[PDB]
Design a protein around this ligand. Structure first.
Ligand SMILES: [Zn+2]
Ligand SMILES: [Zn+2]
Lengths: 116, 56, 245, 161, 233, 50, 107, 202
């Protein structure tokens, strides 16, 4: 969705249409600053979303002693050490798919075999 | 409990008492069984009161 | 073999049973049932362990349900009688730019979902664009009726300084900390609203506190000593006025 | 079920689908608001074929440049036997003739519904500000208060023997 | 419980000063957009600032608490996933002690810091009363062999039930209980003894683990109505 | 406009513009190092109250 | 030091014998904003000190990227004589230093 | 060590000039580089004044023009009360910071209001680079965060609150631009420049 903020007063820009060119601009509601749009998308509602599945991954995730260890193979470095966890979204509609984080390259993969 | 790893769904992790009373319960099984018994006791008390009111 | 731990009052041994209470200065997010205009509420029972011993509760409510076309966030402040928009509170705290407000709330440049849910707040608080107007807007809502037209700004400032998040500080010159903490509360509330975290468990023993004979006698003695000092002042006034020794 | 078809499962599913209340919210993934200079060409690569087909085979001069896009789930529309024609006609009859909608066929790799609000002969300058806001409002209403098929106050139905 | 205790609370200002001097950036100049990796530092529920290396900060804090520079009752929790470091000093928190587990690469596997020499000195001090240098529970706490843990800090630790089988890296008597090893090599603490979860009344029941829990509750209630010798005076 | 604002004039002058923000940290390879470590440990170890 | 506001009567000419405008003459002066530890600040911010004595020296590498402070031997061998200046912000914007003094009230 | 490095003397600031003077930090809060030497319209005044109604206050240029045109034209209590103990330091801070710093340029193009920051008021220390290669040390006193005021013609409390009432009466999207076309709700800078130009044209 790429929200854009004003360049002069750091306020929030809003979409507007210019009929002279029949184009889309983003203008600030208080300072009169305009900028041509880059994409035609201005709104998105994600009723079924996968954002937050891997939230919480940090450079020191492996330092957590509570995370379970696994022997699965990371298919980018051929390593056997990794820490896996379930989806972090608490909605009662998600699958039990596991997400594995490699302790050698910090890569994240999944155990899904249906859609991947 | 603070003895298993995060996101553990095994029976021993979610409260399956494998042992019997004759053998004896391991500490985790003991705690889970105590939780169940507490549920039963609370149900007993509340249901006693409500049933008394209903009967009256 | 006697172990003590009790008091002897009028010859009867008395033991003070520990009292369990919910811990303070912790933000807790709760979900509300369907028959209500509030879906999620983030509450903090601001408490200070030393100096005044009074408790002030701050609540941030997300009005509207999942089927509504506009869900805004409103915060209830002490002695205001009404819930003020978070954007207006931020402007009164000194952050007029909407970009800076969203920086204080959301810490990721790609969390467009949370920014989308935050759009209504800035839309609602669009009219107010400066600290003086925000301060007077908050002030006139207060239940004082002594401030006529010019002390409104100072009254709102004093409220936001001494009665808003007192556990952080009560001295002038710490608006940034208050703004950051408010943004943290709103961020947690928005996470719960987006269903990325579950509502805080009220039975968690880590959020509970056990008050022993120490704190109980401490607060009782605080009250009694306040009464004693009041009586001393009353005697001083009486002697000075009625011309007594 | 009727005594003459109690043992049948296909008719059981038919009646269950005829009584269960399903809304577009249950068979859509996301809704988007797009800007298109004219109602004859598109910027989305995918809908280029759909617009060409429907426009070629068959008013459109006064269609608004703001477009409302719904992305529908085939896995959601296969759990309950639904086809794009029924939902398209449902949308077209919720608002009789005050907005134009096109829908891709089931054979398409992705399922998308495109809608455009049609403006009247009179030109309103004050409504331009809330044009997108009106689009979001109609999106919410068409997501919540639309009864594709079924009876009101019916959450879910389960077939048992 | 038998080994449960309630903290009396201390002053947080020294901890605030320590955090400030050890690299806790003030909250007045924290810009999230230019540092989307900092860990937020909380003290008694107050967001005091952010830190860039929470690993080193927590290591130093834990070492100080273990050796006795910071009051052991102070609770410290590091939420790695949430990028938060919470320090609690207020009174009223319930905690209990636990053994400390360290790598101890000498044996190649994690083991309890407490050793048989320590136990020998403890027992010597116990029996000399009925004169070697005093060696008490405070001595253990100051030597960092045991650590007080509250419910909040318990959220971020892994506890081994017993050192007999869970600590060693890894026929069976048919009468013995079926115990799950859990095959975990990341233990940070060990229970002193599970039998300490019970209370005063529940510690009189013999073999309570062979009983139904409601019977244990009934016995706990009734044992307070049994005749004995309440006092010698 | 408003005819009175009640200002408070004062003598002020700009005497520099900040260009670099520096943090002073004791060198890890200094012979007098680790004295500050003891002092900082004492900052928390010592208790003022009686 | 209270005084009128707009002052449309031109009272400043006689009330104050000095210019009331901000003096923008020394603004073109490089300044370093340095954060010191508690032990060093407790002796560098003292008012009963700072008589103009030499507190030490600054050593900067010719190629840059490393700056150090070398204090003199006046510390009483109680604190390190060598420190590192970590540049938290190589480029700093919108930061200035201004003074504040009273004005002459006569003539 | 070799002489590859560069060393400069570090000297203390004489205390004879540090008395009766306080050195503070000024921090402009904006995303664009601000330089009062070139960007501002000299002269510039930095004083203390009430910030209430900081939209209809006479500009310095307007006051000068007003002076010119004026010259041309003329050519019982309760006797017993309780006072609450309050720390002297805090009381002095409140009295001194009651009127925040205001920095206004000549034409009103820039008008900044400062707020006191207590997080790191004293921890900082200033090092001034003398014009000889040496450095001079000065302690810091206070930190002030300056924010711009009335740059895009902010509305008033009455109008804003009257516009917030009533669900159905939603705020128009481009109201600021539409009203700016009407001429009402302008800034001090524009209001002063237009009138000064109307005088200059004659
Ligand atoms: Zn703008
Ligand atoms: Zn890998």
């Amino acid at each position: 969705t790429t929200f854009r903020f004003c360049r002069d007063c750091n306020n929030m820009l809003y979409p507007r249409e210019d009929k002279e060119n029949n184009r889309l601009l983003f203008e600030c509601r208080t300072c009169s600053y305009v900028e041509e749009a880059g994409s035609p998308l201005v709104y998105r509602h994600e009723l079924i979303t996968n954002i937050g599945e891997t939230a919480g991954v940090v450079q020191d995730i492996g330092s957590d002693p509570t995370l379970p260890r696994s022997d699965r193979e990371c298919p980018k470095c051929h390593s056997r050490e990794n820490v896996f966890f379930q989806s972090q979204q608490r909605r009662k509609d998600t699958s039990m798919v596991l997400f594995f984080v490699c302790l050698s390259c910090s890569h994240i993969f999944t155990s899904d075999q249906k859609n991947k | 409990l603070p003895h298993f790893s995060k996101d553990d769904y095994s029976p021993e992790s979610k409260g399956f008492v494998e042992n019997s009373y004759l053998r004896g319960l391991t500490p985790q099984e003991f705690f889970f069984h105590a939780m169940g018994g507490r549920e039963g006791l609370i149900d007993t008390a509340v249901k006693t009161a409500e049933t008394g009111y209903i009967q009256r | 073999f006697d172990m003590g731990g009790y008091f002897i009052i009028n010859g009867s041994e008395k033991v003070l049973i520990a009292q369990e209470r919910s811990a303070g200065n912790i933000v807790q997010v709760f979900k509300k049932a369907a028959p209500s205009p509030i879906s999620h509420v983030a509450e903090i029972r601001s408490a200070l362990e030393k100096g005044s011993r009074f408790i002030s509760t701050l609540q941030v409510k997300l009005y509207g349900r999942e089927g509504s076309s506009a869900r805004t966030i409103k915060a209830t402040l002490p002695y205001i009688k009404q819930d003020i928009p978070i954007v207006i509170i931020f402007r009164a705290l000194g952050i007029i730019p909407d970009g800076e407000i969203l920086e204080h709330i959301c810490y990721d440049v790609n969390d467009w979902q949370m920014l989308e849910m935050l759009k209504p707040c800035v839309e609602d608080g669009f009219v107010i664009q400066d600290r003086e107007t925000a301060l007077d807007f908050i002030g006139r809502r207060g239940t004082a009726l002594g401030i006529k037209k010019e002390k409104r700004i100072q009254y709102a400032k004093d409220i936001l300084q001494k009665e808003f998040l007192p556990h952080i500080t009560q001295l002038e010159g710490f608006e940034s900390r208050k703004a950051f903490f408010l943004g943290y509360m709103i961020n947690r509330l928005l996470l719960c609203a987006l269903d990325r975290k579950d509502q805080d468990d009220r039975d968690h023993f880590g959020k509970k506190r056990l008050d022993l004979a120490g704190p109980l006698l401490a607060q009782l003695f605080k009250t009694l000593f306040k009464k004693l000092t009041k009586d001393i002042f009353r005697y001083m006034q009486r002697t000075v006025e009625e011309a007594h020794d | 079920l009727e005594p003459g078809h109690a043992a049948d499962q296909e008719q059981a599913k038919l009646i269950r689908s005829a009584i269960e209340h399903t809304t577009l919210k249950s068979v859509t993934i996301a809704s988007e608001i797009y800007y298109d200079p004219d109602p004859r060409s598109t910027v989305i690569p995918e809908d280029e074929e759909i617009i060409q087909l429907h426009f070629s085979l068959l008013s459109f001069d006064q269609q608004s440049p703001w477009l409302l896009r719904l992305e529908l789930d085939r896995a959601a529309m296969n759990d309950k036997d639904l086809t794009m024609g029924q939902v398209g006609e449902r949308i077209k009859q919720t608002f009789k003739n005050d907005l134009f909608v096109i829908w891709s066929e089931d054979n398409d790799e992705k399922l998308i519904i495109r809608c455009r609000v049609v403006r009247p002969k009179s030109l309103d300058a004050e409504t331009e500000a809330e044009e997108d806001h009106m689009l979001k409002k109609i999106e919410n209403t068409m997501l919540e208060n639309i009864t594709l098929r079924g009876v009101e106050n019916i959450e879910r139905v389960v077939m048992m023997k | 419980s038998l080994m449960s205790c309630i903290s009396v609370g201390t002053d947080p200002m020294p901890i605030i000063t320590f955090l400030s001097e050890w690299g806790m950036e003030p909250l007045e100049d924290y810009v999230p957009h230019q540092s989307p990796d900092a860990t937020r530092v909380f003290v008694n529920g107050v967001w005091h600032g952010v830190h860039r290396n929470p690993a080193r900060l927590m290591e130093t804090l834990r070492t100080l608490r273990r050796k006795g520079d910071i009051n052991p009752e102070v609770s410290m929790i590091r939420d790695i996933r949430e990028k938060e470091l919470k320090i609690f000093t207020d009174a009223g928190r319930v905690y209990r002690p636990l053994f400390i587990v360290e790598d101890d690469e000498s044996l190649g596997h994690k083991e309890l810091k407490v050793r048989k020499g320590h136990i020998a000195k403890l027992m010597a001090t116990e029996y000399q009363d009925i004169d070697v240098e005093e060696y008490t529970w405070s001595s253990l706490l100051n030597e960092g062999l045991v650590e007080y843990i509250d419910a909040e800090e318990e959220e971020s630790i892994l506890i081994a039930m017993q050192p007999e089988d869970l600590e060693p890296a890894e026929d069976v008597d048919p009468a013995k209980r079926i115990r799950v090893s859990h095959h975990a090599t990341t233990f940070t603490h060990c229970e002193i003894h599970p039998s300490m979860i019970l209370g005063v009344a529940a510690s009189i029941i013999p073999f309570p683990d062979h009983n139904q829990s409601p019977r244990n509750t009934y016995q706990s209630a009734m044992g307070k109505q049994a005749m004995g010798v309440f006092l010698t005076n | 406009y408003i005819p009175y604002v009640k200002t408070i004039p004062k003598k002020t002058a700009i005497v520099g513009t900040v260009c670099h923000e520096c943090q002073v940290m004791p060198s890890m390879n200094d012979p007098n190092y680790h004295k500050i470590v003891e002092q900082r440990r004492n900052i928390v170890k010592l208790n003022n109250k009686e | 030091e209270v005084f009128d506001g707009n002052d449309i009567e031109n009272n400043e000419t006689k009330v104050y014998e000095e210019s009331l405008d901000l003096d923008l003459e020394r603004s073109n002066r490089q300044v370093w904003l340095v954060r010191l530890p508690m032990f060093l600040a407790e002796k560098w911010r003292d008012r009963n000190n700072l008589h103009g004595q030499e507190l030490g020296k600054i050593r900067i590498n010719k190629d840059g990227s490393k700056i150090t402070l070398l204090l003199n031997e006046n510390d009483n061998d109680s604190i390190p004589h060598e420190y590192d200046l970590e540049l938290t912000k190589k480029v700093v914007e919108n930061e200035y230093v201004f003074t504040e003094q009273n004005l002459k009230k006569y003539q | 060590d070799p002489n590859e490095y560069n060393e400069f003397p570090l000297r203390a600031i004489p205390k004879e000039d540090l008395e009766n003077m306080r050195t503070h930090l000024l921090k402009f809060q904006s995303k664009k580089k601000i330089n009062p030497v070139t960007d501002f319209h000299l002269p510039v005044r930095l004083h203390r004044k009430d910030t209430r109604n900081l939209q209809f206050q006479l500009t310095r240029a307007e006051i000068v023009q007003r002076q010119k045109e004026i010259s041309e034209y003329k050519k019982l209590r309760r006797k017993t009360r309780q006072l609450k103990v309050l720390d002297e330091n805090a009381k002095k801070l409140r009295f001194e910071e009651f009127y925040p710093w205001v920095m206004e340029d000549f034409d009103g193009y820039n008008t900044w209001v400062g707020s006191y920051e207590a997080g790191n008021s004293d921890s900082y220390v200033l090092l001034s680079v003398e014009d000889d290669g040496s450095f001079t040390m000065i302690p810091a006193d206070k930190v002030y965060k300056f924010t711009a005021r009335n740059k895009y013609a902010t509305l008033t409390i009455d109008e804003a609150e009257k516009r917030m009432d009533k669900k159905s009466g939603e705020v128009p999207r481009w109201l600021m631009k539409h009203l700016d076309n009407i001429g009402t709700t302008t800034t001090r800078y524009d209001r002063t420049r237009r009138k000064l130009k109307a005088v200059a044209d004659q």
